[PDB]
């Protein structure tokens, strides 16, 4: 938590969705469903 | 969509080109030249003034 409250880096997982812009199964959507960028928990 | 497909990565060292490749490694590239601009010309002129 001390390393969180100092660091300039913020972890912002919508960069993945912005590079994808996606929408059977497609491999572009399968990695989104596998990475789950809605989850904000990077402990 | 005015250069929205250019800002998904690094906007510093941008370049535009295309290529395709056959089976045997043979690649055919097309690098179009950048033609002149008048907006950038007038911005650099105003910057000079």
């Amino acid at each position: 938590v001390l390393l969180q409250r100092i660091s300039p880096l913020q972890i912002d997982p919508t960069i993945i969705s912005n590079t994808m812009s996606t929408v059977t199964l497609s491999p572009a959507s399968s990695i989104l469903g596998k990475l789950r960028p809605s989850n904000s928990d990077f402990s | 969509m005015l250069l929205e497909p250019l800002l998904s990565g690094d906007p510093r060292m941008t370049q535009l080109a295309i290529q395709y490749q056959q089976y045997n490694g043979r690649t055919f590239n097309v690098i179009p030249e950048m033609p002149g601009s008048v907006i950038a010309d007038c911005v650099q002129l105003t910057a000079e003034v």
Partner: protein, 49 residues
């Protein structure tokens, strides 16, 4: 006086290129993506697709 790290470190400046391939982490990501392209290039290792 020293602190062991599992990652090589460099002096801290801000305008590093985003596509720098001299640091071991971005080089690692690039090589893993290249090997998965080689693994997926021909259709073998994935039939039934």
């Amino acid at each position: 006086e020293v602190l062991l790290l599992p990652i090589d470190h460099q002096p801290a400046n801000v305008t590093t290129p985003t596509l720098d391939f001299t640091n071991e982490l971005t080089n690692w990501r690039a090589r893993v993506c290249e090997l998965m392209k080689n693994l997926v290039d021909n259709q073998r290792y994935q039939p039934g697709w």
